[PDB]
Amino acid sequence: MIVSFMVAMDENRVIGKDNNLPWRLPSELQYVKKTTMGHPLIMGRKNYEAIGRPLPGRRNIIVTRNEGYHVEGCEVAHSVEEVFELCKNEEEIFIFGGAQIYDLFLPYVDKLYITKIHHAFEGDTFFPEMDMTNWKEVFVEKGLTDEKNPYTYYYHVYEKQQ
Ligand SMILES: CN(Cc1cnc2nc(N)nc(N)c2n1)c1ccc(C(=O)N[C@@H](CCC(=O)O)C(=O)O)cc1
């Protein structure tokens, strides 16, 4: 099964602020809906509270070690091992994030979905960095800059095929 990371970040790798994210970019959330639809999202508790509801069309799966955590509309996994058990029959998995969630699935990733916003915000969680020792660009693009969406980001994708 394909473990794909799905991430938007600063030019300084910031992905988050207090708990809620640094920006607010409707069109970005579009690309995300699009590429993700019909696939499981694996996220941590704190990432889900930011979102604040289940994302329609996708098995939302939350990752806590806590044996008594439940939210409606979402599955809970208390392990990386469980995540693969729930997604046994699954084509592709999207690690939706929380930095610590990315750290968990680092030994398993085979595909990366990075958005790079050029502008630097105030906040404190970061994307766990990885490979100029790989991987392979497989796609680039620019996105909508508007009155809402005001920043030059680039939709990226990579593939570790080794
Ligand atoms: C806080 N946040 C986390 C978030 C935001 N942008 C990201 N962008 C990328 N590229 N990757 C992520 N991991 C990511 N995560 C959110 C908040 C709301 C929605 C949301 O309501 N998304 C709708 C999109 C359209 C809508 O807003 O209704 C969806 O169904 O996917 C998504 C992510």
Side-chain angles (χ1 to χ4, degrees), residues 10-147:
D10 268 4
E11 43 185 1
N12 293 125
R13 307 213 149 215
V14 173
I15 70 187
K17 256 202 78 221
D18 54 313
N19 182 34
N20 309 322
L21 86 175
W23 43 90
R24 184 144 145 251
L25 275 41
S27 177
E28 215 276 313
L29 302 190
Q30 228 47 53
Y31 180 70
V32 175
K33 199 175 182 148
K34 175 168 169 284
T35 355
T36 168
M37 191 56 124
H39 288 87
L41 264 29
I42 321 305
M43 64 199 78
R45 292 185 47 153
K46 281 61 200 60
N47 201 9
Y48 168 85
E49 276 115 273
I51 307 178
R53 42 131 212 161
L55 268 28
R58 280 146 288 167
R59 315 172 40 189
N60 282 50
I61 296 175
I62 309 172
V63 186
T64 325
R65 19 176 176 112
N66 186 165
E67 99 203 59
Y69 183 85
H70 304 296
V71 40
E72 201 38 303
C74 295
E75 309 175 62
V76 187
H78 312 88
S79 284
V80 184
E81 80 69 24
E82 271 208 67
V83 162
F84 294 154
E85 198 66 41
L86 310 167
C87 314
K88 199 157 47 167
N89 272 53
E90 212 79 29
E91 308 76 75
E92 204 180 333
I93 301 311
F94 290 83
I95 323 299
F96 216 49
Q100 306 283 298
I101 300 304
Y102 297 117
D103 290 323
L104 261 205
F105 291 87
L106 231 28
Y108 324 98
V109 247
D110 358 47
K111 178 162 313 209
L112 222 199
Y113 297 58
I114 288 208
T115 298
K116 315 182 164 209
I117 292 71
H118 299 105
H119 178 285
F121 309 85
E122 194 53 85
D124 46 36
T125 203
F126 282 87
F127 176 72
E129 82 161 294
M130 319 146 53
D131 279 343
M132 260 64 50
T133 155
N134 229 52
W135 259 19
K136 203 93 262 85
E137 259 285 21
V138 104
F139 187 74
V140 197
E141 198 198 9
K142 169 199 295 299
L144 230 200
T145 307
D146 297 51
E147 299 201 52

